[PDB]
Amino acid sequence: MYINNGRINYNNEYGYRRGIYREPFYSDNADYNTNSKSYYDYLARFNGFIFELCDF
Amino acid sequence: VNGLADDIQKMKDTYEALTLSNTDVTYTVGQKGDFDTLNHCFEHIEDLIVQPKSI
Amino acid sequence: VNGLADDIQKMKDTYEALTLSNTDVTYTVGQKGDFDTLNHCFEHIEDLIVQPKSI
Amino acid sequence: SKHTTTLYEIIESELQRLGLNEFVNNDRIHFNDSKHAFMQKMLYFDDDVKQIVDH
C-alpha cells in the first residue's frame, strides 16, 4: 500500500466487462425496479417555471 | 486535476513567500529530540520569518 | 479536489496578508458586515500571516 | 414514481426551493456530504424537513 504520488488516476482492476466479453467477477442474474418520472413531475417542473415567472 | 496540482506545485516553488505558515508548533529538545540543545531551539525560533500562533 | 481548493485558498490568504501589511484595514461586524459575529472576526485576524499597519 | 410522485421527491423539491445545495456547500464539494445531502437529512428529521412536512 503506497500513495498515488499526489496525482489521482482512475483504473478498474475488477470490471464488469472487458471489451465485448463479460468478466466473471460480478453477477447479472438480478432484476431491479426502475422508477422514472411520471406526469406529476412534468407538472412540477412547469409549476416551477410558473413560480419564477410570477416572482419576476 | 493533476495539471492543476502541478500548477500549484510549480507556483509554490517559484514564489517562496506563499509557503509561509503560522500554524502551531511543538519543538522537542533532548538527546533524540528535534533540537540538540535549548539554545538551538530558541535560535531557530528567532529565525522563523513568521511567528506561529503558539509554540 | 477539496485539497486543491484548500491549497488555493491558503495561498490566496497568505498573499493577500503579505501585500496589505502597509495598508490600513476596516472589518465591519454585524448582520451585513464582513463577519457574522465578533468571534469570527477575530479568528480571521488571528490567522493573518502578517498583521497590517492598523485594523 | 412510475405513476405518481414519492414523498421523497416532494420533500426534496421543497428543500431545493429553500435554497439549499447538497454538493458545493461552503466552497468544498462533496458528492455525499452526509451533513447537507437531502438524504441523511430527512432520515435524521432535521428542522427543515419537519417544517416541510407540517406545511
Side-chain angles (χ1 to χ4, degrees):
Chain A
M1 301 135 288
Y2 291 80
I3 317 178
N4 44 27
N5 274 7
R7 315 278 156 262
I8 184 170
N9 283 297
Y10 173 70
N11 73 346
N12 224 317
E13 201 76 351
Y14 307 134
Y16 166 62
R17 69 185 315 112
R18 184 161 101 211
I20 294 186
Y21 296 73
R22 173 216 298 186
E23 291 284 72
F25 303 114
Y26 292 76
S27 78
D28 291 347
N29 50 40
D31 190 5
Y32 305 113
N33 202 25
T34 291
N35 284 337
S36 291
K37 317 284 183 173
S38 174
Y39 174 58
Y40 204 173
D41 299 352
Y42 201 76
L43 269 204
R45 302 195 78 254
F46 191 78
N47 269 352
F49 164 74
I50 280 297
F51 182 74
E52 311 256 10
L53 170 57
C54 286
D55 272 5
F56 201 91
Chain B
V1 166
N2 300 324
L4 292 195
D6 283 340
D7 273 28
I8 284 178
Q9 181 63 24
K10 174 212 171 43
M11 144 193 292
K12 269 186 177 176
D13 282 17
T14 285
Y15 303 169
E16 322 95 309
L18 307 169
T19 326
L20 286 178
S21 97
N22 66 345
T23 178
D24 310 32
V25 186
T26 52
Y27 309 109
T28 172
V29 197
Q31 288 216 283
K32 294 183 320 302
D34 295 355
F35 295 94
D36 163 14
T37 80
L38 190 55
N39 261 355
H40 280 104
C41 174
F42 271 94
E43 197 280 335
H44 167 75
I45 284 179
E46 91 179 331
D47 257 6
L48 305 180
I49 294 185
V50 174
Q51 282 281 335
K53 291 139 60 177
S54 84
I55 307 182
Chain C
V1 172
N2 298 324
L4 294 199
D6 279 349
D7 277 8
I8 294 297
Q9 176 65 20
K10 154 92 171 203
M11 284 162 40
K12 280 170 57 184
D13 283 356
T14 293
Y15 193 84
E16 284 177 7
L18 252 69
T19 201
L20 297 187
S21 67
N22 320 121
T23 290
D24 165 326
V25 315
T26 56
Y27 294 130
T28 50
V29 169
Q31 203 74 80
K32 326 175 68 32
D34 296 351
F35 302 91
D36 156 22
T37 78
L38 192 57
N39 256 320
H40 280 98
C41 169
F42 270 102
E43 282 188 12
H44 193 155
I45 293 183
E46 175 201 355
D47 272 326
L48 291 186
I49 304 299
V50 164
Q51 310 287 344
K53 209 156 59 53
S54 60
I55 300 183
Chain D
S1 209
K2 272 190 315 306
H3 313 99
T4 52
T5 81
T6 59
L7 289 196
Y8 172 85
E9 284 181 353
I10 305 179
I11 296 185
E12 181 181 52
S13 174
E14 296 314 280
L15 276 175
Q16 284 171 338
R17 194 71 51 51
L18 252 51
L20 294 66
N21 194 332
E22 31 182 346
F23 301 104
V24 85
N25 274 322
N26 54 36
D27 324 285
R28 314 262 170 281
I29 175 172
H30 284 263
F31 174 58
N32 53 250
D33 226 333
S34 61
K35 174 72 141 33
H36 309 81
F38 299 115
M39 261 285 168
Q40 316 272 342
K41 170 169 295 177
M42 328 153 41
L43 287 187
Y44 294 110
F45 210 63
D46 252 26
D47 231 329
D48 310 2
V49 178
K50 186 164 134 52
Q51 262 170 26
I52 294 189
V53 171
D54 284 3
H55 162 27

